[PDB]
């Protein structure tokens, strides 16, 4: 709680799509090394020996993503051998967890300068590739009523009364705002085009985006089909016995996209940045980890946001921009409803429905998105949060400096 | 390491040893203490010695045949011992099955072919022995069954059954087809799914065929002789191991699918089987086998296995041995059955009587009505024909056994009458009156009645000695119980004849003394009445239904209420009120009665009238009536789910104890199986009487815990939950 | 601002690789067993005040996949708000978990945190998770990937540790582990593993060979490291003509199954729950050295943590370095001139085994106990790591 933690750089790759995606040919490690080389380009004279750790979120750390990918990035990029490298997994929150952990290490006084972020090549290493202690264990799975995320999302809509038109209306809005952000040049300096070994362009934009999405197009889509595999609806209603029928409103068009991507954030103390001649962009005000029922699974953001607001001594009114990962439309609408968040403050540059959700990286991507938008708006405070599998929640407050 | 129970300082021998000139050893299992070979202490020591000798004489042994000298091959384990196992006995149970499996593992890894010659039923432990063999030949004989039914006793196949079937078929197929439900297979079916390898026409062919198979295997496959597929270098589990991407993608849904099937009921055996199967698949055979033992010991020392062993082994045995059948009575074969009424009950009764091989005359008020009654059997036969379960020849003879009529005179030659007309005393008097002189003078005069006292119905006939309650349950083709009700005038010979009829149609009998509501109807009443009371209190209908299914009932209580018909429920309550008020007493209505009357007033008296707690369209149940929440202020009362569950289960258990006290039921066996088979009391409880002595809750186990919880519910929900004096100390 | 205190430190016995007692036990069950033991120690502990569960795990796949820390939170019936994150910093993962927990506590944004590790190596062998440094040619070729046993033999060659030198250290580790066990040092901290029926599975460190002799150790054959790796190592270390292969299964860490858990919190968080602090986390440091030699990271990390705490070797009562290989310990001792009687005093991984993700948390707990038993002040705990990393932690007895 001693040293203040500052964000000095926050960058990300574009997000490549799942099917015939541009990044499918690119190793997850290459995605990270690309970002390291961009930071090097932006700060040629930085003493990399002062970087004490590299902390990467990664939800499926197997195959191309196994063997501590953070250390692999340190060594492959030719960073100093003293620069650490640790992989972590807190499901969807991994990217923000890595940043929070980086900030907390700086606050402790025992690290000076840390690279944090995440990477997920979902087209190469699909969700669930890592097995899972819960799933490979029927005795565990049976007791703790395991239910896939989409069913919990549908259940949220059923209870709160969010219609198919309501969730699709949010989806359209996300596409519109992502398109507006891109057209406006909001992402120009922070999205770093992926290039090959020869400098040739692979991807420079978020190719999952569908900027010409319509209300009618969204209405024509089918509900999600772990889904189609029976049992989970009945299991969910065994816990939620007062609910008669789950309304299945979520589709590929109102749920986050499966994509490939990476994000990097440079975090350090005031002195660490001053010594390297770095300009601070934001201060990490507070972090919080909380949770809720693992069967509904995705209501964790509400308690985590409440806990981070209380810890920073702030209220909903004090925050200029709210950024919540768009895993499912109803999750966002529920969060908005619970805390009376104004529309104009919520996911203002679009979200994962439009641009995709590369699990391990997402937290760091939407954090960077907020650093940039605070500067662009000349606003003061942003709250960043994500829902998480197992019913967890993580939240962070940043202040523009 | 030893093949024996003890290794320090005296049971009978059950295995006959014979070694041929060719070096083939026949082990013929023949327990002197019974007509069945059972996996007991005598078997364990006998097989231990036999297996020791197989190893000791291995230089002169070329092969082994495992045979039986009984009518059946081998069936069951020591249930008497297993039912007594306390938590502190977990070590001994573990050791017992570990010793059993050590013997079979040796047999299986001998370096020589071992062949099971299956002459008759091989069930549970019996099939587990056979699965340790490298080849299985079965005699395709009548009554022969193969399977692993220990889940039906709240156990699991702990002698290698789980481990081996999973190794043979993979996780999904072994679980779904063999283990989860303990399916019994005819030899032909057993061969089809790979549980058996070869079939022979007669039992005498078995041993010679086994020896011939050993001969050929040694000649044609010398390197692989006596090697199971899973003991080979390049073994692949069918469907893959849990680490293979294909199975890994569907595996997490296996427990949820199981939970869906069981509706959230607390029956631990199926989940223990699934855990043992998957965990076993992750490791080598021996480790898999040991994990299996630990899950077995867990079930054995648990309360549910004790409930299920008590009901589905001991209670069923007692009932099928004529426990409620009066002693010194002979037999009287039935030639011609007459059914009165062609509704669901009468049509169903005609079907099960005709399927058993009896001629049936099916009478209703018109030929059109009686014919549509036979149409019920036609639809069942058509569906069985498409499923391939019977032949066109066999089906035609079945239907031709049913003669639909409108003429009373067509009951000529009838020696067994089963009436299934509308619930009305004067109608039943009249319908029997029209027929009592037309039938044979010795004919049983049976009535399918839900509530009306048999003694009162009997007055409508001349020979009251032959009048009796023969109570079936809807749908008759599926429901296994017949509640036999003794009227005051009913003779003991009449009881026995209906008892024998019940067995002949493949159903299970209980014998009950006359009392309105008898056993089943009265007790099922308390279950639905609790549900309706909860609805009146303001409990969400969806929760009430969930509570019913999670308690373990085959159908939720509001759904069931629609089928029972609220008008019938009403007049049942009206009848009870009349009895009390006529005797000068003051009637105390169940809080459900106001909810019943409310629904009648609203024109929603059940499925038959088109509307009840559920909506009905096109002959199908739609969903819960949306006006239900506003009518009863649903959501205003939100008690714990476990309280809702317990109110239903406890109401029935307490009512069963009243029936036992009043002398309606004469045994706990009849109470247990009667509740399970008649009114769908959850199998895991072992029955409505077993529930009392085997209750398990947060605050302990047993009769004392039941009393405490009953008193707990009474303080919160009303005095009806206070236990009878019979349960107190 | 806040200080981080260790309130509890426990571990499973370590199950051996071949025919091991723990092979039948899921790694999740190992963690849940330890959570149940902590609950038994403090039945009135308000679990709602536990804000996170941080577990090291080097092969997070299959049984160890899907954030095993969260799985443990849910399977143990801990509050849904209690977190769960898996981390991997190779061999240091267990200590990294503890250090991260301490850093979160110090930051003021976490109150009370469970930290530790789990590795069931018999069920999930190392390398099971794949990786780019090993499996991707372009980057494998450039980082000069060499298995750790070769770096260890290379250290012995450069330093002049003979086969008898490494074997002598190995014997000492067996003796000291046997003595710690027979002396009852481990009675409180090693939690017997039991099945679902309460039957004993394992209550002791199976890998131990207390009857080890110098003559038996001499019989063993040198120690996959088969195909090309010697020449790769010597390409970088060009002045050494030939690697002397001194390491065997007898003087290297044992491959084992095990888990470890540590309860960490601020003074206020412990006071509120009536917990007594056992030790204070003085300082942490991560550093590194050449990834080819791989196993020389402990030295600069220990150097960094000592300077950070304003201490010298002379201020430290006990030194605890994971015994991955005998040469690594001897190298560490040589560099920092560590007195023999201060080093790995209760034996180490050569005797008891190295369950990768758990080890750091196990040997940390070992030092918490030994400081308490000796009534000594400070211990320094460190581990060598794949890719040439190094982590170090100083604890002070309270």
CA–CA dist C55, C70 (Å, integer) = 9
* DSSP summary character for residue C8: E
Q: Is B315 helix (H, G, I), strand (E, B) or coil?
A: helix
Provide CATH code, domain A133-185+285-398: 3.40.47.10
* Beta bridge mates, B107: none
Q: How far apart, in Å, are the Cα atoms of C150 and each of B522, B575, C170?
A: 81, 92, 18
Contact A259, A17 (CB under 8 A): yes
CA–CA dist A176, A164 (Å, integer) = 19
Q: What sign does the dihedral C108-C109-C115-C120 (CA atoms) show?
A: negative
Q: Which of C83, C100, C102 is nearest to C2 (CA)?
A: C102
Q: Residue ranges of B for the binding site for NAD(+)?
A: 342, 344-345, 364, 421, 423, 428, 448, 450
* DSSP summary character for residue B439: S
Q: How far is C130 from chain B (nearest CA, A)?
A: 14
- What number of other Cβ atoms are within 10 A of residue A399's Cβ? 17
The answer for residues whose C-beta is within 8 angstroms of residue B193's C-beta and 6 or more apart is B169, B177, B178, B185
CA–CA dist B225, B217 (Å, integer) = 6
* Beta bridge mates, C286: C391
Does A87 sit within 8 Å of C88, measured CB to CB? yes
Contact A224, B245 (CB under 8 A): no
- What number of other Cβ atoms are within 10 A of residue C374's Cβ? 13
Domain B1-333 superfamily per CATH = 2-enoyl-CoA Hydratase; Chain A, domain 1 (3.90.226.10)
Report whether CATH 3.40.50.720 matches the domain B334-517: yes
- What number of other Cβ atoms are within 10 A of residue C135's Cβ? 15
CA–CA dist B639, C307 (Å, integer) = 62
Residue ranges covered by each domain of chain A: 1-125+186-284, 133-185+285-398
Does C51 sit within 8 Å of A289, measured CB to CB? yes
CA–CA dist B272, B264 (Å, integer) = 15
Q: CA angle, B679 as apex, B674 and B684 as ends, to 5°?
A: 75
Report whether CATH 3.30.2130.10 matches the domain B518-729: no
CA–CA dist B609, B563 (Å, integer) = 10
What's the Rg (C-alpha) of chain A? 20
The residue whose two tokens read 């893959």 is: B240
Element at C116 (helix H, strand E): strand C112-120
Starting at the edge strand that comes first in sequence, how are the strands of the sheet with B444-447 ordered? B402-405, B359-363, B336-340, B416-419, B444-447, B467-471, B481-486, B508-513
Q: Which of A1, A11, A83 is nearest to A49 (CA)?
A: A83
Q: Which of B2, B197, B4 is nearest to B113 (CA)?
A: B197
Q: Which fold has domain C132-184+282-395?
A: Peroxisomal Thiolase; Chain A, domain 1 (3.40.47)
Residue ranges covered by each domain of chain B: 1-333, 334-517, 518-729
DSSP string, C136-177: -HHHHHHHT---HHHHHHHHHHHHT--HHHHHHHHHHHHHHH
CA–CA dist A100, A93 (Å, integer) = 10
* Tokens matching residue B245: 């991407």
- What number of other Cβ atoms are within 10 A of residue B608's Cβ? 15
The answer for residues whose C-beta is within 8 angstroms of residue A5's C-beta and 6 or more apart is A102, A103, A104, A106, A107, A267, A268, A269, A283, A284
Residue ranges of alpha helices (H) inside chain C are 27-41, 68-75, 93-107, 132-135, 137-143, 148-159, 163-182, 214-219, 229-236, 267-272, 298-308, 326-336, 349-352, 356-374
Q: Is C381 helix (H, G, I), strand (E, B) or coil?
A: strand
| CA A48 from centre of chain | 27
**Please, which chains are in contact with C (at least 3 CB pairs closer than 8 A)?**
A, B
* Tokens matching residue A320: 């200029």
- What number of other Cβ atoms are within 10 A of residue B56's Cβ? 10
User: In terms of CA atoms, which chain A residue is nearest residue B274?
Assistant: A138
Of the residues C27, C35, C54, C66, the best mutation for testing chain A's interface (the one with the most A CB atoms within 10 Å of its CB) is C66
Does A109 sit within 8 Å of C90, measured CB to CB? no
Q: How far apart, in Å, are the Cα atoms of C338 and each of B195, B702, C317?
A: 67, 64, 10
- What number of other Cβ atoms are within 10 A of residue A214's Cβ? 12
Contact B363, B403 (CB under 8 A): no
Contact A102, A367 (CB under 8 A): no
Count of CB pairs separated by less than 8 Å, B with C: 31
CA–CA dist A299, C81 (Å, integer) = 11
- Residue A63, sorted as left (phi over 0), alpha (psi -120 to 50) or beta, turns out to be left
The answer for residues whose C-beta is within 8 angstroms of residue C149's C-beta and 6 or more apart is C223, C225, C247, C252, C325
| CA B292 from centre of chain | 25
CA–CA dist B399, B390 (Å, integer) = 13
CA–CA dist C337, C334 (Å, integer) = 5
Q: Which of C353, C346, C329, C365 is nearest to C191 (CA)?
A: C365
CA–CA dist A323, A351 (Å, integer) = 9
Does C100 sit within 8 Å of A90, measured CB to CB? no
3-state secondary structure chain A: CCCCCEEEEEEECCCEECCCCCCCCCCHHHHHHHHHHHHHHHCCCCCHHHEEEEEEECCCCCECCCCCHHHHHHHHCCCCCCCCCEEEEECECHHHHHHHHHHHHHHHCCCCEEEEEEEEECCCCCCCCCECCCCCCHHHHHHCCCCCHHHHHHHHHHHHCCCHHHHHHHHHHHHHHHHHHHHCCCCCCCECCEECCCCCEEECCCCCCCCCCCHHHHHCCCECCCCCCCCHHHHHHHHCCCCCCCCCCCECCCECCCEEEEEEEEEECHHHHHHCCCCCCEEEEEEEEEECCCCCCCCCHHHHHHHHHHHHCCCHHHCCEEEECCCEHHHHHHHHHHHCCCHHHECCCCCHHHHCCCHHHHHHHHHHHHHHHHHHHCCCEEEEEEEEHHHEEEEEEEEEC
* Tokens matching residue C41: 């120690």
Chain C residues inside the 8 Å CB shell of A72 = 131-133, 139, 143, 387
Using the Cβ of A221 and the Cβ atoms of chain B, whether some distance falls under 8 Å is answered with no
Using the Cβ of A235 and the Cβ atoms of chain B, whether some distance falls under 8 Å is answered with yes
Does B283 sit within 8 Å of C23, measured CB to CB? yes
CA–CA dist C217, C207 (Å, integer) = 15
* DSSP summary character for residue B342: -
Given 2.40.30.10, 1.10.3720.10, 3.90.79.10, 3.40.47.10, which CATH number is that of A1-125+186-284? Answer: 3.40.47.10
Element at B712 (helix H, strand E): helix B703-717
Q: How far apart, in Å, are the Cα atoms of B507 and each of B352, B380, B495?
A: 9, 18, 15
Element at B560 (helix H, strand E): helix B557-564
Phi, psi of A282 (to 5 degrees): -155, 160
Topology match between the domains C1-124+185-281 and C132-184+282-395: yes
- What number of other Cβ atoms are within 10 A of residue B110's Cβ? 20
Q: Which of B589, B453, B615, B451 is nearest to B532 (CA)?
A: B589
CA–CA dist C62, C237 (Å, integer) = 38
CATH class of C1-124+185-281: alpha beta
CA–CA dist B299, B314 (Å, integer) = 18
Q: Which of A364, A399, A365 is nearest to A382 (CA)?
A: A399
User: In terms of CA atoms, which chain B residue is nearest residue C20?
Assistant: B287
Q: Residue ranges of B for the binding site?
A: 36, 75, 77-80, 125, 150, 173, 177, 184, 189, 192-193, 317, 342, 344-345, 364, 421, 423, 428, 448, 450, 641-642
Using the Cβ of A135 and the Cβ atoms of chain B, whether some distance falls under 8 Å is answered with yes
Chain B residues inside the 8 Å CB shell of A246 = none
Does A138 sit within 8 Å of B274, measured CB to CB? yes
* DSSP summary character for residue B176: I
* Tokens matching residue A324: 């919540």
Q: Which of B24, B109, B110, B21 is nearest to B67 (CA)?
A: B24
β-pairing verdict for B416-419 and B444-447: parallel
Of the residues A62, A142, A152, A158, the best mutation for testing chain B's interface (the one with the most B CB atoms within 10 Å of its CB) is A142
Experimental method of this PDB entry: X-ray
* Tokens matching residue B344: 């669901």
């Amino acid at each position: 709680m001693s040293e203040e933690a500052f964000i000095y750089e926050a960058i990300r790759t574009p997000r490549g799509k799942q099917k015939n995606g541009s990044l499918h040919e690119v190793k997850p490690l290459s995605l990270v090394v690309g970002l390291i080389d961009e930071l090097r380009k932006r700060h040629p004279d930085l003493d990399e020996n002062l970087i004490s750790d590299v902390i990467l979120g990664c939800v499926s750390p197997v195959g191309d993503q196994g063997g501590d990918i953070a250390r692999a990035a340190v060594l492959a990029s030719g960073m100093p051998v003293t620069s650490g490298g640790v992989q972590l997994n807190r499901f969807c929150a991994s990217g923000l967890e890595a940043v929070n952990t980086a900030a907390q290490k700086v606050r402790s006084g025992w690290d000076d300068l840390v690279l944090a972020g995440g990477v997920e090549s979902m087209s190469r290493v699909p969700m669930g590739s890592d097995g899972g202690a819960m799933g490979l264990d029927p005795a565990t799975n049976y007791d703790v009523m395991f239910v896939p995320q989409s069913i919990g999302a549908d259940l949220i809509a059923t209870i709160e009364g969010f219609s198919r038109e309501d969730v699709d209306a949010y989806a359209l809005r996300s596409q519109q705002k992502a398109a507006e952000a891109w057209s406006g040049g909001y992402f120009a300096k922070s999205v770093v085009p992926v290039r090959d070994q020869n400098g040739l362009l692979i991807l420079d934009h978020d190719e999952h985006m569908r900027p010409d999405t319509t209300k009618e197009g969204l209405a024509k889509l089918k509900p999600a089909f772990l889904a189609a595999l029976g049992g989970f609806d009945d299991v969910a209603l065994q816990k939620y016995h007062w609910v008669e029928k789950i309304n299945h409103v979520h589709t590929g068009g109102n749920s986050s996209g499966i994509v490939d991507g990476a994000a990097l954030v440079m975090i350090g103390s005031a002195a660490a940045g001053k010594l390297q001649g770095l300009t601070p962009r934001a201060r990490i005000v507070a972090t919080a980890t909380s949770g809720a029922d693992p069967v509904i699974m995705l209501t964790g953001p509400t308690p985590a946001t409440r806990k981070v607001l209380d810890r920073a001594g702030l209220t909903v009114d004090d925050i200029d921009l709210f950024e919540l990962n768009e895993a499912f439309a109803s999750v966002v609408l529920k969060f908005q409803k619970d805390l009376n968040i104004p529309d104009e403050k919520l996911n203002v540059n679009g979200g994962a429905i439009a641009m995709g959700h590369p699990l391990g990286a997402t937290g760091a991507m939407i954090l960077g998105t907020m650093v940039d938008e605070l500067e662009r708006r000349n606003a003061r405070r942003a709250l960043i949060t994500l829902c998480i599998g197992g019913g967890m929640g993580v939240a962070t407050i940043i202040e523009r400096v | 390491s030893s093949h024996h129970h003890h290794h320090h300082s005296m049971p009978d021998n059950t295995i006959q040893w014979d070694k041929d000139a060719d070096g083939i050893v026949t082990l013929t299992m023949d327990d002197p203490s019974g007509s069945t070979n059972v996996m007991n202490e005598a078997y364990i020591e006998s097989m231990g010695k036999a297996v020791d000798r197989l190893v000791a004489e291995k230089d002169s042994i070329t092969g082994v045949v495992v045979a039986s000298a009984k009518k059946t091959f081998f069936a069951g384990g020591d249930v008497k011992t297993m039912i007594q196992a306390r938590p502190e006995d977990a070590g001994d149970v573990f050791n017992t099955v570990e010793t059993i499996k050590r013997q079979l593992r040796t047999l299986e890894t001998l370096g020589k072919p071992v062949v099971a010659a299956i002459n008759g039923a091989a069930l549970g432990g019996g099939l587990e022995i056979a699965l340790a063999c490298h080849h299985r030949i079965a005699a395709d004989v009548k009554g022969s069954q193969l399977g692993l039914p220990e889940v039906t006793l709240g156990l699991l196949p702990g002698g290698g059954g789980v481990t081996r079937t999973v190794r043979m078929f993979g996780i999904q197929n072994a679980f779904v087809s063999v283990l989860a439900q303990g399916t019994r297979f005819k030899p032909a079916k057993a061969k089809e799914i790979g549980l058996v390898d070869e079939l022979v026409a007669t039992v005498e062919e078995l041993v010679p065929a086994a020896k011939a198979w050993i001969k050929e295997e040694l000649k044609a496959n010398p390197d692989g002789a006596g090697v199971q597929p899973w003991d080979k270098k390049g073994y692949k589990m069918p469907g893959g191991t849990p680490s293979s991407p294909g199975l890994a993608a569907i595996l997490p849904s296996f427990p949820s699918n199981l939970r869906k099937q069981l509706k959230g009921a607390p029956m631990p055996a199926p989940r223990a089987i699934l855990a043992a199967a998957v965990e076993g698949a992750q490791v080598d055979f021996d480790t898999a086998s040991r994990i299996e033992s630990r899950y077995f010991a867990s079930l054995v020392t648990g309360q549910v296995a004790k409930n299920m062993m008590q009901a589905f082994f001991f209670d069923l045995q007692a009932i099928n041995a004529g426990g409620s059948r009066p002693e010194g009575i002979g037999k009287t074969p039935i030639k011609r059955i007459g059914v009165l009424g062609a509704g669901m009950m009468g049509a169903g009764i005609a079907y099960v009587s005709a399927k058993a091989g009896y001629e049936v005359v099916l009478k209703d008020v018109s030929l059109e009505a009686a014919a549509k009654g036979k149409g019920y059997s036609e639809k069942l036969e058509a569906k069985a024909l498409e499923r391939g379960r019977t032949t066109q020849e066999r089906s035609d003879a079945l239907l031709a056994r049913i003669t639909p009529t409108a003429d009373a005179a067509d009951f000529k030659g009838v020696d067994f009458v089963i009436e299934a007309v509308f619930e009305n005393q004067e109608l039943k008097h009249k319908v029997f009156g029209e027929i009592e002189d037309i039938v044979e003078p010795n004919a049983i005069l049976g009535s399918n009645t839900s509530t009306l006292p048999i003694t009162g119905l009997a007055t409508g006939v001349k020979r009251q000695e032959d009048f009796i309650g023969i109570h079936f349950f809807s749908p008759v083709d599926k429901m296994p119980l017949v509640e036999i009700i003794k009227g005051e005038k009913t003779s003991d010979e009449a009881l026995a004849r209906v008892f024998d009829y019940t067995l002949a149609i493949g159903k299970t009998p209980i014998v009950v003394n006359d009392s309105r509501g008898f056993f089943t109807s009265r007790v099922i009443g308390t279950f639905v009445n609790e549900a309706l009371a909860m609805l009146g209190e303001g409990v969400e209908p969806a929760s009430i239904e969930q509570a019913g299914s999670q308690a373990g009932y085959p159908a939720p209580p509001l759904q069931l209420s629609d089928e029972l018909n609220l008008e019938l429920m009403h007049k049942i309550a009206v009848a009870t009120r009349k009895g009390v008020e006529d005797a000068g007493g003051t009637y105390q209505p169940h809080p459900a009665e106001a909810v019943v009357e409310k629904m009648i007033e609203l024109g929603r008296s059940g499925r038959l009238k088109g509307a009840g707690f559920y909506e009905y369209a096109d002959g199908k149940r739609s969903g819960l009536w949306p006006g239900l929440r506003e009518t009863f202020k649903s959501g205003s009362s939100q008690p714990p789910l476990q309280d809702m569950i317990d109110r239903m289960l406890f109401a029935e258990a307490l009512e069963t104890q009243k029936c036992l006290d009043e002398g309606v039921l004469t045994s706990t066996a009849d109470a247990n199986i009667g509740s399970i088979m008649g009114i769908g009391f959850p199998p895991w409880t072992g029955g409505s009487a077993q529930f009392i002595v085997g209750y398990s809750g947060p605050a302990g186990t047993g009769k004392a815990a039941f009393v405490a919880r009953a008193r707990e519910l009474a303080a919160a929900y009303g005095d009806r939950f206070l236990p009878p004096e019979s349960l107190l100390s």
